[PDB]
Design a protein around this ligand. Structure first.
Ligand SMILES: Cc1nn(C)c(C)c1/N=N/c1ccc(/C=C/C(=O)NO)cc1
Ligand SMILES: Cc1nn(C)c(C)c1/N=N/c1ccc(/C=C/C(=O)NO)cc1
Ligand SMILES: [K+]
Ligand SMILES: [K+]
Ligand SMILES: [K+]
Ligand SMILES: [K+]
Ligand SMILES: [Zn+2]
Ligand SMILES: [Zn+2]
Lengths: 368, 374
């Protein structure tokens, strides 16, 4: 298997103002002695370092890309959003919204991030690679057409999908979003459309806060082409496998995608500060293995994984590495040091069964 | 209310080797650019800074203490453990166990940490304060008599309780441990004893990993004087209030404690990396309010809160501040910035009810009886 890895060093240079985790500094929030921000370069930098140090980078097609053109960005975002964002980035940073701070030059870096997503889809559709991974920072899955939220400033996946349809004429795209937070940007953008199947597994009510969304199945022609799977907080491996087996794979089986795109956040991992789920690196591996199987069935193997959230400096590198091993079919020597520990922490049988019953009920609600 | 605050700057100087969160550096674990360890000074340092900046410190009795004497330590720990620990600390640090790394001079700092717990109980029992908070670092609730684990090197609360019994002759002590991890050290130490009631609320199977412990109710005379409440991961405010109302308060009501000690970790907070629970600062306030009510009933108000875990730099300071406001009865101007956000993230009704049913079933297993306070 040829796996392309889309990365650029400059994506790691996007830096907002001082924060303690998600909280802006000022008032009662003391400035951190070190930390700085949750959506930090270091999560992505350490993944990259680990891929290098593992040898895995050497077995991938390392690519950069040109930034997203205005034509590409305007397919999703109004011109007035582009100018407003540019103006603030040029002026020296600030706030595009709450949960959406930017630094100087963040406009160019976000364009680059979107560029990498564009190029990844392009490369898989052109036959240059069997599949691809885009280390896009800043992330995109929360971004609305004219509102930045959740540290997302362009809808990277939506921009990449539109450019793919415009260039190659793909008719059925499926987006599986396994970041722990609800992918509201992707849902909004394609809510009335039947050509993009949008699936989001998320922690019930995490972010956006209090949002579950199981009833929200799409409008108009999109009715039945959006699926929200709000998992109960504290769920881990089994919860996700059940969701995949009972909702995700049946949904894909009916929709017959010609391309599969994954919005892959790793903030469902068991040590993430920004969610309450219990995934380990082999959960993401198993999910990647299942989604590759479906791409081989309907899409001729065509699969793209785009990096989204993940806030554990320590553990995200291992979770992302497991995905890329599964994509490439290359197993490195790296061994997850938390795997065995996290296994022991999983929900008990009764809690698993409670979550399982809910997923069976949701499956029936969706007609699967 | 007079509230004593036991703190010493030196407790913040205990530092183990390089770690990424809980993982030792080396092998496939890259050295952090900044962080260092999870059990880090900054969580405790920021709490202290906030108390200062809020004005709250000025309304408390700020105290240090002498380190724990050998006599005090030997009541819980064998001499062989003391020498072995001292030897390694003198030698320049290393590992006392896995999940128990130490730096140079950690022996003296752990003694100090235990000293502060000793002094807090002493001060409340002598009538110097109505209640007290001990900012003990390193923590103690995992420490076994001859094994350090979970970043704990002396059983601070056990040492403080034994010194209290030896000095003052208290007969019934209750320890309520609301750190998110199972307080195995406290359980082990007092497992065959009926003079110390040990209660632990924890996330089911979190740490120690895979341990639930509901069946473990004490041995011999201790049978019925140890209670484990393994809460389902993802639980928050309501889960804890139910546990308090259905298990903790009825248990205390029957046991009639003459002193209440809280092993207060804040790692059950909703942004903690080391657990999966959803508590906010007003959950800890409400728990502190409930446990003060029980101390006023049976113990003449005598309550001590000892600081344990908590790994969110950003959020722990607010959670601890809420406890100390409740202890002192002094409300500062500080407002929790995550409170409203965390409320929206709480478990849905069906999940709450599922957890509630399990606590009712656990209550019946303990034979606990839901009477109201009297
Ligand atoms: C700013 C701010 N201020 N406050 C008061 C709160 C509560 C704030 N942030 N909340 C957030 C914002 C974003 C996330 C996760 C994003 C992600 O995972 N993308 O995949 C989590 C919490
Ligand atoms: C995992 C893992 N894997 N390895 C290899 C190591 C050395 C690991 N440490 N795990 C731990 C150990 C202790 C805690 C205690 C938390 C606390 O709040 N005490 O109250 C949490 C995680
Ligand atoms: K999601
Ligand atoms: K759709
Ligand atoms: K506990
Ligand atoms: K006991
Ligand atoms: Zn996310
Ligand atoms: Zn703890």
């Amino acid at each position: 298997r040829r796996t392309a890895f889309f990365f650029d060093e400059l994506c790691l240079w996007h830096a907002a103002g001082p924060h303690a985790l998600t909280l802006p500094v000022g008032g009662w929030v003391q400035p951190p002695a070190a930390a700085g921000h949750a959506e930090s370069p270091e999560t992505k930098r350490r993944l990259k370092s680990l891929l290098d140090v593992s040898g895995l980078t050497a077995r991938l097609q390392l690519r950069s890309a040109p930034p997203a053109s205005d034509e590409d960005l305007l397919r999703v975002h109004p011109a007035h959003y582009l100018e407003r964002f540019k103006a603030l980035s040029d002026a020296g940073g600030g706030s595009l919204g709450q949960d959406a701070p930017i630094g100087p030059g963040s406009y160019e870096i976000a364009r680059l991030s979107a560029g990498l997503a564009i190029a990844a889809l392009d490369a898989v559709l052109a036959g240059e690679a069997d599949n691809a991974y885009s280390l896009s920072r800043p992330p995109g899955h929360h971004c609305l057409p004219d509102q930045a939220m959740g540290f997302c400033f362009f809808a990277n996946i939506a921009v990449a999908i539109e450019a793919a349809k415009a260039r190659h004429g793909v008719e059925r795209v499926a987006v599986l979003d396994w970041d722990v937070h609800h992918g509201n940007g992707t849902q909004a953008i394609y809510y009335r459309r039947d050509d993009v199947l949008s699936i989001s597994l998320h922690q019930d009510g995490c972010f956006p806060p209090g949002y579950s969304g199981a009833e929200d199945i799409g409008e108009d022609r999109g009715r039945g082409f959006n699926l929200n799977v709000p998992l109960l907080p504290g769920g881990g491996h089994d919860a996700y496998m059940q969701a995949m087996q009972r909702i995700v794979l049946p949904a894909l089986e009916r929709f017959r995608p010609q391309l599969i795109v994954v919005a892959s956040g790793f903030d469902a991992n068991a040590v993430d500060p920004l969610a309450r789920m219990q995934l380990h690196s082999d959960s993401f591996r198993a999910m990647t293995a299942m989604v590759r199987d479906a791409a081989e069935r309907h899409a001729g193997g065509r699969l793209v994984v785009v990096h989204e959230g993940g806030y554990s400096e320590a553990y995200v590198p291992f979770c992302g590495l497991a995905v890329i091993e599964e994509l490439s079919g290359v197993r490195s020597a790296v061994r997850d040091p938390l795997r065995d520990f996290i296994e022991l922490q999983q929900p008990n049988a009764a809690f698993r069964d409670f979550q399982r019953q809910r997923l069976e009920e949701l499956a029936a609600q969706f007609g699967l």
